[PDB]
Design an enzyme around this catalytic site. Structure first.
Site, short mmCIF file in Angstrom:
data_model
loop_
_atom_site.label_atom_id
_atom_site.label_comp_id
_atom_site.label_asym_id
_atom_site.label_seq_id
_atom_site.Cartn_x
_atom_site.Cartn_y
_atom_site.Cartn_z
N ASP A 35 0.83 -1.20 0.00
CA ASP A 35 0.00 0.00 0.00
C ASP A 35 0.87 1.26 0.00
OD1 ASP A 35 -1.87 1.95 0.38
OD2 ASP A 35 -2.40 1.37 2.45
N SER A 199 -0.88 15.52 -12.11
CA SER A 199 -1.14 15.13 -13.48
C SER A 199 -1.40 16.38 -14.32
CB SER A 199 -2.35 14.20 -13.50
OG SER A 199 -2.76 13.93 -14.83
#
Length: 330
Positions: A35, A199
């Site tokens: 994770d 992004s």
């Protein structure tokens, strides 16, 4: 040193991925959820409340000759999805795909929440976010990657998650045969303890790319792709019959639909998530309403590039002095 381990979807929907981990001496192999959105390595154990164990493999520290109780240490974690666990702490030898760390903090669960009990396939978590998020008290502990880093040939790990298929976590090297084209690297902020990046935008299906900054985290421990409401609305608008369902808790769509792809930007580069990756199947057994793999982050407080996004790429988690993230198509 290096390590390499296969990671496997827990079910037919890729709800999560498990990777075998050797703990203790002799080795006790547990299947853990790697994770990158958290920083605790915790396991079901011989100390876990019996009624809260239902099929998981447990770590029994009393059977490990290298286990040592970390005096006075406890841990307690609550995840974004409402699940939680807590307990005490041992140090022990931990190996992943041939890479060994001695004195790793192994957090032994005394209590776990229902969603963990109900998932017999996950024996615990192995956190790969930054050690600043580690919950051990009163002395914070380091992640497996943090402990291994100096010994690695290169201070990196890579995530290569499969779509409805196995994939690979590598530590200490970049497998140049595992991706196509080049790896585009992008800046990371560690200020919130995550692999947080921006992004450069998105496209829906064959639509035009929208240049817009989307701050989010690369999180292998989250199943879906959580993005701003405007982006998500634009995606599902291209699927006939799709709607946001308050009762279900997100966007649903007719199971008969063919989903469009979703593209996200990494610098000037582009990662394309095939439409099929966004189908998470019937909302309940037998239903013809299917759950969407792209959901709104509104009210999470952060955008999350979870497995839906990451499995479309070969992802480099670069733990150099100034960390960065790398993405390649594959």
């Amino acid at each position: 040193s290096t390590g390499s381990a296969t990671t496997t979807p827990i079910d037919s929907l890729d709800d999560a991925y498990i990777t075998p981990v050797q703990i203790g001496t002799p080795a006790q192999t547990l299947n853990l959820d790697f994770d990158t959105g958290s920083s605790d390595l915790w396991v079901f154990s011989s100390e876990t409340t019996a009624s809260e164990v239902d099929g998981q493999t447990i770590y029994t520290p009393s059977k490990s000759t290298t286990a040592k109780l970390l005096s006075g240490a406890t841990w307690s974690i609550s995840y974004g999805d409402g699940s939680s666990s807590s307990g005490d702490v041992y140090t022990d030898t931990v190996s992943v795909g041939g890479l060994t760390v001695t004195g790793q903090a192994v957090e032994s669960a005394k209590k776990v929440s229902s969603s963990f009990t109900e998932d017999s396939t996950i024996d615990g978590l192995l956190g790969l976010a930054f050690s600043t998020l580690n919950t051990v008290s009163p002395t914070q502990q380091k992640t497996f990657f943090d402990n291994a880093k100096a010994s690695l040939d290169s201070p990196v790990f890579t995530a290569d998650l499969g779509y409805h298929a196995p994939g690979t976590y590598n530590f200490g090297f970049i497998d140049t045969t595992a991706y196509t084209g080049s790896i585009t690297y992008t800046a990371v902020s560690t200020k919130q303890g995550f692999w947080e990046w921006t992004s450069t935008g998105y496209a829906v299906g064959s639509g035009t790319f929208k240049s817009t900054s989307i701050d989010g985290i690369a999180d292998t421990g989250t199943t879906l792709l959580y993005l701003p409401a405007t982006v998500v609305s634009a995606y599902w608008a291209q699927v006939s019959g799709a709607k946001s369902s308050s009762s279900v808790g997100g966007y649903v769509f007719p199971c008969s639909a063919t989903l469009p792809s979703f593209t996200f930007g990494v610098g000037s580069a582009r990662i394309v998530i095939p439409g099929d990756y966004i189908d998470f199947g019937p909302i309940s057994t037998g239903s013809s309403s299917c759950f969407g793999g792209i959901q709104s982050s509104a009210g999470i407080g952060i955008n999350i590039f979870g497995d839906v996004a990451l499995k479309a790429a070969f992802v480099v988690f670069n733990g150099a002095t100034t960390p960065t993230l790398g993405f390649a198509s594959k």
